[PDB]
Design a protein around this ligand. Structure first.
Ligand SMILES: *[C@@H]1O[C@H](CO)[C@@H](O[C@@H]2O[C@H](CO)[C@@H](O[C@@H]3O[C@H](CO)[C@@H](O)[C@H](O[C@H]4O[C@H](CO)[C@@H](O)[C@H](O)[C@@H]4O[C@H]4O[C@H](CO)[C@@H](O)[C@H](O)[C@@H]4O)[C@@H]3O)[C@H](O)[C@H]2NC(C)=O)[C@H](O)[C@H]1NC(C)=O
Ligand SMILES: *[C@@H]1O[C@H](CO)[C@@H](O[C@@H]2O[C@H](CO)[C@@H](O[C@@H]3O[C@H](CO)[C@@H](O)[C@H](O[C@H]4O[C@H](CO)[C@@H](O)[C@H](O)[C@@H]4O)[C@@H]3O)[C@H](O)[C@H]2NC(C)=O)[C@H](O)[C@H]1NC(C)=O
Ligand SMILES: *[C@@H]1O[C@H](CO)[C@@H](O[C@@H]2O[C@H](CO)[C@@H](O[C@@H]3O[C@H](CO)[C@@H](O)[C@H](O)[C@@H]3O)[C@H](O)[C@H]2NC(C)=O)[C@H](O)[C@H]1NC(C)=O
Ligand SMILES: *[C@@H]1O[C@H](CO)[C@@H](O[C@@H]2O[C@H](CO)[C@@H](O)[C@H](O)[C@H]2NC(C)=O)[C@H](O)[C@H]1NC(C)=O
Ligand SMILES: *[C@@H]1O[C@H](CO)[C@@H](O[C@@H]2O[C@H](CO)[C@@H](O)[C@H](O)[C@H]2NC(C)=O)[C@H](O)[C@H]1NC(C)=O
Ligand SMILES: *[C@@H]1O[C@H](CO)[C@@H](O[C@@H]2O[C@H](CO)[C@@H](O)[C@H](O)[C@H]2NC(C)=O)[C@H](O)[C@H]1NC(C)=O
Ligand SMILES: *[C@@H]1O[C@H](CO)[C@@H](O[C@@H]2O[C@H](CO)[C@@H](O)[C@H](O)[C@H]2NC(C)=O)[C@H](O)[C@H]1NC(C)=O
Ligand SMILES: *[C@@H]1O[C@H](CO)[C@@H](O[C@@H]2O[C@H](CO)[C@@H](O)[C@H](O)[C@H]2NC(C)=O)[C@H](O)[C@H]1NC(C)=O
Ligand SMILES: O[C@@H]1[C@@H](O)[C@H](S[C@@H]2CO[C@H](O)[C@H](O)[C@H]2O)OC[C@H]1O
Ligand SMILES: O[C@@H]1[C@@H](O)[C@H](S[C@@H]2CO[C@H](O)[C@H](O)[C@H]2O)OC[C@H]1O
Ligand code: NAG
Ligand code: NAG
Ligand code: NAG
Ligand code: NAG
Ligand code: NAG
Ligand code: NAG
Ligand code: NAG
Ligand code: NAG
Ligand code: NAG
Ligand code: NAG
Ligand code: ZN
Ligand code: ZN
Ligand code: ZN
Ligand code: ZN
Ligand code: ZN
Ligand code: ZN
Ligand code: ZN
Ligand code: ZN
Ligand code: ZN
Ligand code: ZN
Ligand code: ZN
Ligand code: ZN
Lengths: 762, 767
């Protein structure tokens, strides 16, 4: 929008936003005791939140309303109503806050791992606590005018194509179960419960819908039209958004840049009204924000409207309340002049935003959360849950017992473009951290003699660092290589073009494997890289996926390597063979194989052979898993469901298995539970789908902990050609983990039961 | 549905409901301190109303949920959740209550005038207070297990065709302003404010939409398919429902028997979702009830569904939550089995009902409204607002000085089928009253020597009774004829076939007028009758429309006639000439004239000559009305006016463009209250055809003494000036306009709207 020369937004992965959109404001609170609003109902803390917001909005001029439909809202100075920023980032810690540059206060926020790694821990409580800490820290910054009260998080789009530059931000490729679980735990942690009366921080689930690529084939997200079947819409692209609106009661949602089936998400009333509000129960006075700036893109380049005034009017009427950008505040005045919108439609949007602000305690100084301050940031950071998430999430992919490093290992050769990682560990959308503990520093602090060599860059074709690296290796007890990808390779605005290890890193690892010494390789980054050559190289003793480990990253990794903590992470996306992305266009949105070039996408549908499967992860011990069957769903759904708000949440039954530590190392345990069928519902039939997961606390050798995995009605439902979610009678089989240590056959009997009726598109 | 022999519901005006639907339950409240629910969140009075309702519903079996989608909900005995009745009538007082038959308490409730007469008073405060009394009495009965907490009221369909058997129930023919005003005052009075946290009684605005006939031409409402333009739908058939949902925040709404443009109202997602929820902000956890039993009629006779299971599914999915009938509770089980509905869809609807019950204090014994009792019925009844409404509403149509009856009038010949009226005064949907004061008992109480003769029946065809009535007239100082129509003529389930005085009443009136005595005619009933021959007969000294005056009807009538009170009512429908209904089909839903059979419908569009016009009414005095002041500029810029702050108004379209102000001087012999209707017209603003005029305001002023003046101030809201385009959009158009005060047009004021067109409402596309 703010381009200086011609800009092809069908190709360019990044918009050109106005400085106003991108500005860092200084925030504050209305003075309800002495200010101009003191006798208005909005300042009456005993009144209803809607009635309060309505009373306030009645005081605005038309132009004031319009200006306050943008993310950087100017407020209304004459009313003592301060500017308010809607665009705040919280993906895995505070970002876009007005951080102090000196003074020892508000200089930083806790930098948790990227969600990709945190989700690999398979721990729901963990996700929830991270969210709670983030929203405590948000309130603290807010109380000093340095952060808003709503957050553009979480990013829960399915990591469908492995080359997506933003998959790192997500809880993985399983939109239906794993992502939805993350969605619920994160949003309830941000918001302080399930639609509590006193909202903590408003979540903004994103990006709705069909957004999972930046610019593959030079087709920008900004102009992309996702051709998606109704079946896939219901099955893969929206179930996490149903979870957000229905179960978590997210106060906000962000509509995506792209179109779906010819309709821009932000101008899509089927999306924003029929689905979001009428099918999934999105809060009445919840509000929708556009992406930055998806309203502009309705016009340029989507051409769904002919100018900015019309793009504004179409988005507003479809259900987009707040524009991250300048199209609303600078063109809705034209929309009004042209009769395209009423003042009613504009007031509703602003009223929605302020209704949430009222709920958030914006006008109530005595509100419980208005007293959080810097010491609460200090205290929650000192809990070291960022370290804990990283430690629980790290994935051991290959190991011959070389890990944990034996007491005999005294010197290490520390090699690779991730060996001295600091800011690399933070991924993206991060603010300043209190500290960043590199793998190098953590290695020294662990008490190893460290021979550090860069060896080679992430993406270089230079070998001039090889010799010194081999030299450092030849004079060390073990080699620890840390490499892979980072945000120079995968980023917002630019997808990868391939999913192989970048540069000449694999050559360096090969030459290191032929040194004669034990070799541990840490594959870092969010997306996966093809590590088949490492899998098949016997001289590569150990392979670890370390994701983006956050502020205490080095210590988390080296506590795992040294065996202080025992790894238990599992992959939350498939590591595909490198040729996968060359086999079919990556913006083919069809999940199922087509018998042509599309081989099936994700662990659910892929007919090929993953290098490492979704759900791969090894332990420092061995476990012995043992089991501890005609179900009539219609009957099961006929019963009372105390403890569950929605009927589809009830277990069909609970999978019970004993988990014995048959080895000789204390270890926590993780499990994914999969189901499959070859006769229930329509063909084609999936490989399998995830229906449950859990993490159990450290189990001692000889001890047995019980794994209980409820199998909800919603999880056994399949999706028909119309998008309906229906539980079908037939034969199913559970399988525990990728190793399928335990399997359980059961039959579903009775008639088909409808779980959701998918509505017709407009 | 419960017919014993073949029933043709395309023709038959009344359904055959199962006894279960019609049953009189004994109600009670759950014990939230000690009962099975005490630890459930529903019994936590500090929790959110939605969360409370969700916690309760979670405890139900599927069958218990299904069974509690009917109006006579059985509750859940094992949970200590009592049966609850959704079908409670309150149109003009409590009805379908479990009235006691002995013991001196709860044997009766106040019987107000039918809303048609109440509305004629043009008094907003009156309507609101009536509604407040009704809801106080509702809660009092509720607290003794004798009534529910939601009411199937108000009926606010525009009384469009004059032969409608139920137009009597409505605030008249002006859907946009007059009916919408009644809707607001009544619903907020019923509900105890504007969506208050503590709801007093849930209102159910009805009937949505296109419903304004019972069985004209033997086409029953049960199978009627209204063909209505989007323009008419926005302009005439729905504005009162926008008002109910948006301004009044009605907690419930009732969907109609009929289809509109091929889609039954209760299976109509455009109506129940797109318009109701997305356009007008109907409460998120408000609920929709069908009419009794419109869900059944989706199948039989509409054939929109092939069976009851499919009819239930379609109605539920479209947005109908509660069935007045047994289609839901006895066939949603089948819908579920067939995969047509989810348990989620069923749960939402029951949760919706119980969310309102939570808000109504159904689970909180300490709720403000849970202590109201029989003494509160006695107290509110004794205020005599029923009497007051009738006396305010009575309309003086014709007079030469005969009314009020002079002191010279000692004896009266009281003639007519309405002369000894008791139950006739109650109209329809009435429960037992404390008493009923007939016009006969009232005349005797007031001190006149009364010579009473029936004369003829309402629909009588014999002249045998004439002679005694004529003899009585000859002995008396004045003749007071009371007749017209009643509920043997106009009723639920059966429209009138014509709009003339029934039977030989006019022939009797003619002969009474040949006697040579002063003659006063009281024209009773809700619908109008063609009184043109009474209008032109110089020996009919006076004509009064008395509507259905309720429990103290006789005293209201004779206090007016005696001059103890002075009349100020104005007609709220057009009194058409009898020919009107025989010129064009009465199910032609187009308001505009078409240059063929349709002369235009209502005072807004009618091109013929009313016998008495909408807004007709005379006083016991005369008034001089003069423009008080106008804004310096009479060129109003709507876009600019709407751009300003609007403190004191929730919605921008509610702000005044300006205020019409007049001085009202009593220029006669007698102290009198005053009423005014304010009309606007345009010859160039908006699209053609241009209407006659349309109502934009009204008011009633307190007694004005001879020679004294009072101020009349009538704001002109932006919404009132908006016109409707061919697509249903509400747009304020620039151009020339003229206000006219009353039917006599005593004051007129030209103004101009300048600047661009302004969109007030975008009418959504149908599905
Ligand atoms: C203001 O409010 C007050 C308080 O409510 C009103 O006062 C009440 O007024 C009514 C009506 O006048 C009065 O009820 C009558 O009481 C009489 C003595 O107790 C009764 O004899 C009379 O009974 C007749 O009506 C019954 C209906 O239930 C019939 O069933 C019964 O058969 C009686 O009818 C006989 O008599 C009538 C004429 O008298 C005759 O036509 C019949 O054929 C039959 O022979 C009434 O019940 C109350 O007692 C008053 N209550 C109090 C507390 O004072 C007052 O009316 C209000 N004012 C206005 C203007 O509305
Ligand atoms: C699934 O995730 C949950 C939630 O994160 C996790 O439970 C958590 O475990 C951590 C780690 O033990 C707990 O963190 C501690 O909490 C107390 C507060 O009660 C703090 O005092 C502790 O801080 C000190 O100790 C740290 C570690 O020794 C030091 O680094 C630090 O500087 C402090 O001195 C510490 O933060 C946390 O309390 C729980 N959280 C909850 C909600 O229970 C659980 O273990 C995971 N489950 C499985 C099976 O893995
Ligand atoms: C558990 O939480 C504590 C408290 O936040 C962490 O302690 C902190 O560790 C960092 C990194 O080593 C220290 O920062 C460093 O401090 C030195 C000296 O002041 C400075 O020269 C370095 O540049 C660096 O900033 C920090 O001082 C220390 N803070 C406290 C209060 O002890 C600890 O790291 C956490 N544990 C894990 C495993 O993450
Ligand atoms: C709609 O609003 C925009 C933004 O306020 C207007 O554009 C501004 O016009 C003013 C006055 O001419 C200039 O001084 C500003 O520099 C413009 N601002 C921006 C951000 O472009 C626009 O003119 C308005 N349109 C109408 C019809 O009122
Ligand atoms: C590892 O990275 C750290 C941090 O980026 C490097 O530390 C810097 O070292 C220079 C002196 O050589 C100091 O002046 C800077 O203040 C340090 N930077 C920061 C951000 O603290 C360190 O050199 C790197 N180690 C290597 C390359 O072996
Ligand atoms: C309009 O109706 C109101 C409400 O019923 C009338 O005010 C009532 O008048 C009666 C009889 O004088 C009193 O007993 C009530 O207490 C009054 N009620 C209230 C709420 O004030 C009012 O007189 C009518 N207005 C006009 C102008 O005739
Ligand atoms: C759905 O529910 C209705 C109401 O309970 C069932 O109708 C009853 O069926 C029994 C046995 O068929 C009959 O004896 C009764 O006459 C019916 N009762 C009533 C009140 O009508 C119906 O069977 C159920 N259908 C299904 C498929 O479960
Ligand atoms: C006017 O109507 C009243 C009420 O219906 C009549 O009162 C009834 O008259 C009969 C016979 O006289 C009595 O036995 C009943 O008890 C009365 N019923 C009630 C409810 O009061 C009255 O007779 C009628 N008057 C005339 C003159 O026809
Ligand atoms: O998740 C969304 C992102 O989609 C956008 S991306 C945005 C593009 O425009 C500039 O380059 C911005 O710096 C960049 O963040 O940002 C908002 C997030 O919440
Ligand atoms: O306003 C509605 C009415 O339309 C229905 S009509 C109903 C038809 O079936 C029986 O005869 C009943 O006695 C009659 O009321 O009733 C409910 C009202 O609220
Ligand atoms: C910006 O790019 C658009 C096309 O996206 C083009 O129409 C316009 O001319 C450009 N603006 C400027 C100032 O170059
Ligand atoms: C803009 O980019 C699109 C997609 O990459 C491409 O098809 C088109 O040729 C480009 N248009 C211009 C004018 O360069
Ligand atoms: C995308 O565009 C750039 C030119 O800016 C080009 O270097 C690159 O080869 C293109 N990629 C594809 C797949 O066409
Ligand atoms: C803007 O675009 C709309 C269509 O999206 C069109 O109807 C309107 O006339 C356009 N206005 C101007 C000023 O070009
Ligand atoms: C399943 O349950 C339903 C309802 O409980 C029952 O009607 C049906 O007969 C059962 N069918 C089987 C095969 O168990
Ligand atoms: C009731 O009427 C329907 C048609 O409306 C007819 O099919 C049926 O025979 C009747 N039922 C009975 C029991 O007479
Ligand atoms: C039912 O009534 C309709 C309309 O009055 C008529 O067309 C039809 O012939 C009747 N059907 C039967 C079976 O009598
Ligand atoms: C009921 O009618 C519907 C059509 O509305 C049809 O699809 C369904 O199969 C019918 N069910 C039965 C049991 O006949
Ligand atoms: C009056 O009506 C009755 C019953 O309908 C009938 O027997 C009689 O013939 C009618 N008489 C006249 C004069 O219309
Ligand atoms: C009406 O007001 C609008 C908004 O202030 C302004 O743009 C326009 O010029 C005005 N038009 C007239 C005719 O006064
Ligand atoms: Zn003070
Ligand atoms: Zn102050
Ligand atoms: Zn919590
Ligand atoms: Zn509180
Ligand atoms: Zn513009
Ligand atoms: Zn008790
Ligand atoms: Zn009130
Ligand atoms: Zn309260
Ligand atoms: Zn049929
Ligand atoms: Zn039909
Ligand atoms: Zn059936
Ligand atoms: Zn005729």
């Amino acid at each position: 929008q703010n381009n200086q020369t011609y800009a092809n937004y069908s190709a360019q992965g990044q918009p050109d936003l106005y400085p106003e959109t991108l500005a860092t404001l200084t925030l504050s609170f209305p003075d309800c005791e002495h200010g101009p609003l003191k006798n208005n109902l909005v300042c009456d803390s005993s009144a209803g939140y809607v009635e309060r917001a309505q009373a306030l909005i009645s005081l605005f001029t038309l132009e004031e309303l319009i200006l306050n439909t943008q993310n950087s809202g100017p407020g209304v100075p004459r009313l003592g109503l301060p500017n308010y920023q809607v665009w705040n980032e919280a993906l895995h810690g505070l970002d876009r806050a007005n951080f102090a540059t000196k003074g020892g206060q508000f200089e930083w926020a806790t930098s948790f791992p990227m969600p990709i790694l945190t989700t690999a821990a398979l721990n729901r409580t963990l996700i929830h606590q991270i969210a709670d800490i983030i929203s405590t820290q948000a309130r603290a910054f807010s109380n000093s005018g340095r952060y808003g009260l709503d957050v553009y998080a979480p990013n829960v789009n399915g990591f469908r194509s492995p080359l997506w530059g933003r998959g790192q931000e997500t809880p993985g490729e399983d939109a239906f179960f794993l992502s939805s679980a993350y969605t619920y735990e994160y949003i309830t942690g941000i918001q302080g419960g399930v639609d509590p009366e006193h909202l903590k921080v408003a979540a903004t689930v994103k990006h709705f819908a069909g957004y999972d690529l930046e610019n593959w084939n030079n087709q920008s997200r900004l102009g992309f039209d996702a051709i998606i079947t109704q079946q896939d819409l219901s099955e893969y692209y929206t179930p996490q958004f149903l979870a957000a609106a229905r179960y978590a009661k997210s106060r906000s949602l962000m509509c995506a840049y792209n179109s779906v089936n010819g309709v821009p998400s932000c101008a899509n009333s089927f999306f924003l009204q029929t689905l979001l509000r009428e099918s999934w129960g999105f809060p009445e006075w919840g509000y929708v924000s556009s992406d930055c700036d998806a309203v502009y893109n309705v016009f340029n380049p989507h051409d769904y409207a002919s100018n900015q005034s019309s793009a504004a009017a179409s988005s507003l009427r479809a259900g987009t309340d707040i524009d991250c950008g300048q199209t609303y505040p600078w063109h809705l005045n034209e929309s009004f002049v042209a009769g395209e919108v009423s003042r009613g439609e504009i007031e509703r949007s602003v009223t929605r935003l302020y209704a949430n602000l009222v709920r958030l305690g914006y006008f109530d100084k005595k509100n419980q959360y208005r007293s959080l301050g810097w010491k609460d940031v200090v205290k929650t950071d000192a809990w070291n849950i960022s370290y804990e998430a990283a430690v629980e999430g790290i994935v051991l992919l290959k190991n011959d017992g070389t890990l944990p490093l034996s007491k005999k290992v005294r010197s290490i050769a520390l090699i690779g473009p991730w060996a001295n990682a600091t800011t690399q560990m933070q991924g993206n959308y991060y603010g300043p951290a209190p500290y960043l503990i590199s793998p190098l520093e953590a290695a020294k602090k662990a008490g190893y003699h460290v021979n550090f060599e860069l060896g080679t860059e992430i993406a270089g074709n230079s070998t001039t660092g090889f010799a010194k690296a081999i030299a450092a290796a030849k004079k060390s007890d073990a080699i620890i290589y840390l490499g892979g990808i980072d945000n120079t390779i995968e980023q917002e605005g630019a997808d990868r073009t391939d999913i192989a290890w970048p540069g000449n890193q694999l050559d360096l690892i090969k030459q290191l494997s032929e040194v004669g010494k034990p070799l541990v390789v840490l594959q870092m980054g969010g997306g996966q890289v093809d590590s088949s050559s490492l899998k098949s190289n016997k001289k590569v003793n150990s392979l670890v996926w370390g994701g983006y480990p956050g502020q205490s990253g080095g210590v988390a990794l080296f506590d795992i390597l040294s065996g202080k903590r025992a790894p238990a992470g599992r992959l939350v996306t498939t590591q595909y063979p490198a040729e996968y992305v060359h086999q079919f266009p990556q913006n083919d949105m069809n999940l199922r194989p087509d018998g042509k070039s599309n081989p099936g996408q994700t662990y659910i549908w892929y007919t090929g052979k993953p290098v490492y499967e979704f759900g791969s992860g090894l332990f420092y011990t061995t476990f012995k898993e043992t089991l501890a069957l005609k179900f009539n769903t219609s009957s099961i759904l006929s019963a009372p469901h105390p403890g569950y708000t929605y009927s589809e949440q009830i277990p069909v039954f609970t999978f019970e298995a004993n988990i014995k530590n048959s080895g000789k190392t204390e270890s926590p345990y993780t499990a994914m539970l999969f189901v499959r069928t070859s006769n229930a519902g329509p063909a084609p039939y999936p490989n399998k789908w995830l229906v449950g997961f859990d993490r159990l606390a450290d189990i001692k050798p000889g001890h047995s902990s019980k794994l209980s995995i409820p199998i909800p009605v919603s999880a056994l439902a399949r999706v028909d050609s119309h998008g309906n979610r229906i539980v079908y009678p037939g034969k199913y089989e559970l399988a525990l983990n990728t190793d399928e240590s335990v399997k359980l056959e059961f039959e579903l009997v009775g008639e088909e039961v409808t779980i959701e009726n998918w509505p017709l598109e407009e």
